[PDB]
């Protein structure tokens, strides 16, 4: 009569690495590294992303005509820019503190687009019909949807002074522009004052702008430039515009709401009718694993990104079917 | 192994035993069969479960982390951000891989330990009433039915009960 002490074995082909030996076959093991995604842009915690399509952030905020107009009010969990955005700044120039504005937008969860300075009603004795071919739409020369090009009316450009009081109860992103003609000829033809100035003030914002006239290399067939500026108008505060030329006035502005865990990503994937708690530019991750090798860029509650190709932890014994 | 048990003086495992990690194979007049030791197996299960749970818990949830943008005159800040991201990545990959390696080694050696411990417990239970025929097997100096084998399994062997007969067959 005999009795024997022995250990488990099975058909497991799971392999794990140790410090002493690589590639050890074992009976039981868990994978700690998520490597699978669904290749889809998904809702994050029930909230759909804000897709800009043909536009980038600048083209959207300025209101580039080549992009399909969004709803007046939107909420999102994250913003998606397409890699190939040919539609952005359509009139050549510099978007001052653009990156900082993006960073601001990274914590914005909602916007309401609204008419801060109504077209015909806010700028009497000024022409509001100015357009350009740099901002084309359906063949015809056009202009930014959220801005207004104020030009001379009847051979005169009276000093304008208008103001808005923020009664929205939220921060209001206000954008405006400064036009810079290539020569003093066009300067006089458009604003009738060779020594013009724009003044924008709030309780904490205070800036003065002066036209800079010089011939420049053509960009998008324009020797002229246009600088774009923005500011966050605090609740209850007043913004005052006071200019005698060269002002690209605000027409629409944005009421912003703040949120958490948002961001801006660049992605190729398309929106599908699905929901996730973790989103990457490549697709959504549905996992409880601590690690992932899918992408460093994440939105939501995600596993820590690593460069590893394999993180398998052994739970069973060394498997020997002998 | 480290304790010389698994892939040692017990060269192979029993695919016939599919209801436990460690266990027994009895052979007597009534027949032969496998039967796992539930105590040490449950212990190992609990320990390793707590280990895995630990490794998972030590990794906090990685919340939202997106890239930033920089203009042509902010190359230094851009490079700094890149250095930060890359550094953290290096460190975390290092930590993950290392941790998994160490824990795997320790786990294997842990199983080795448990097997050898079981063997030693059985051996100390039997004493000189049986002989070690190698391969982690014992040969009895007496008859042993299923009830006797069961008495050995659950840690209740009776030495004085068979000491005389064993002493006889030992000669």
């Amino acid at each position: 009569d005999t009795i024997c002490i022995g250990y488990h074995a099975n058909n497991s082909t799971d392999t794990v690495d140790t410090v002493l030996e690589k590639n050890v076959t074992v009976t039981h093991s868990v994978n700690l590294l998520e490597d699978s995604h669904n290749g889809k842009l998904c809702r994050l915690k029930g909230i759909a992303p804000l897709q800009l399509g043909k536009c980038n952030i600048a083209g959207w905020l300025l209101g580039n005509p080549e992009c399909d107009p969004l709803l007046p009010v939107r909420s999102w969990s994250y913003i998606v820019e397409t890699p190939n955005s040919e539609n952005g700044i359509c009139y050549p120039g510099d978007f001052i503190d653009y990156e900082e504005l993006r960073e601001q937008l990274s914590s914005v969860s909602s916007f309401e687009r609204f008419e801060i300075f109504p077209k015909e009603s806010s700028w009497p004795n000024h022409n509001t019909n100015g357009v350009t071919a740099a901002c084309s739409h359906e063949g015809k020369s056009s202009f930014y949807r959220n801005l207004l090009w104020l030009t001379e009316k009847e051979g005169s450009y009276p000093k304008l002074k208008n103001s808005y009081v923020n009664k929205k109860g939220k921060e209001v992103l206000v954008l405006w522009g400064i036009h810079h003609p290539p020569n003093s000829k066009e300067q006089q033809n458009l604003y009738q004052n060779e020594n013009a100035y724009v003044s924008v003030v709030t309780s904490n914002y205070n800036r003065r702008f002066t036209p800079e006239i010089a011939e420049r290399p053509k960009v998008r067939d324009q020797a002229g430039r246009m600088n774009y500026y923005w500011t966050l108008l605090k609740p209850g505060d007043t913004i005052i515009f006071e200019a005698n030329g060269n002002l690209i006035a605000p027409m629409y502005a944005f009421a912003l709401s703040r949120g958490f865990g948002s961001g801006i990503i660049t992605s190729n994937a398309s929106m599908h009718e699905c929901n996730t708690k973790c989103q990457t530019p490549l697709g959504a991750i549905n996992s409880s694993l601590p690690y992932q090798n899918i992408h460093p860029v994440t939105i939501g509650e995600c596993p820590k990104y690593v460069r590893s190709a394999k993180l398998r932890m052994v739970t069973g014994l060394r498997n020997i079917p002998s | 192994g480290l304790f010389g048990a698994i892939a040692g003086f017990i060269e192979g495992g029993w695919t016939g035993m599919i209801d436990g990690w460690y266990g027994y194979h009895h052979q007597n007049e009534q027949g032969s069969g496998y039967a796992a030791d539930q105590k040490s197996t449950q212990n190992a299960i609990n320990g390793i479960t707590n280990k895995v749970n630990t490794v998972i818990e030590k990794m906090n949830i990685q919340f939202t982390a997106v890239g930033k943008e920089f203009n042509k005159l902010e190359k230094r800040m851009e490079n700094l951000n890149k250095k930060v991201d890359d550094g953290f990545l290096d460190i975390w990959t290092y930590n993950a891989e290392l941790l998994v390696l160490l824990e795997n080694e320790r786990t294997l050696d842990f199983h080795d330990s448990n097997v050898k411990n079981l063997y030693e417990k059985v051996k100390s239970q039997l004493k000189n009433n049986a002989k070690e025929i190698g391969n982690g097997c014992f040969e009895f100096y007496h008859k042993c039915d299923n009830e006797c084998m069961e008495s050995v399994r659950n840690g209740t062997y009776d030495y004085p009960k068979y000491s005389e007969e064993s002493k006889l067959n030992r000669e």
Binding site: - | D19, G20, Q42, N53
Partner: peptide, 11 residues
């Protein structure tokens, strides 16, 4: 998580 490798294990 649980390691359900055997059925008698407790959960």
């Amino acid at each position: 998580x649980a390691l359900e490798y055997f059925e008698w294990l407790s959960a």
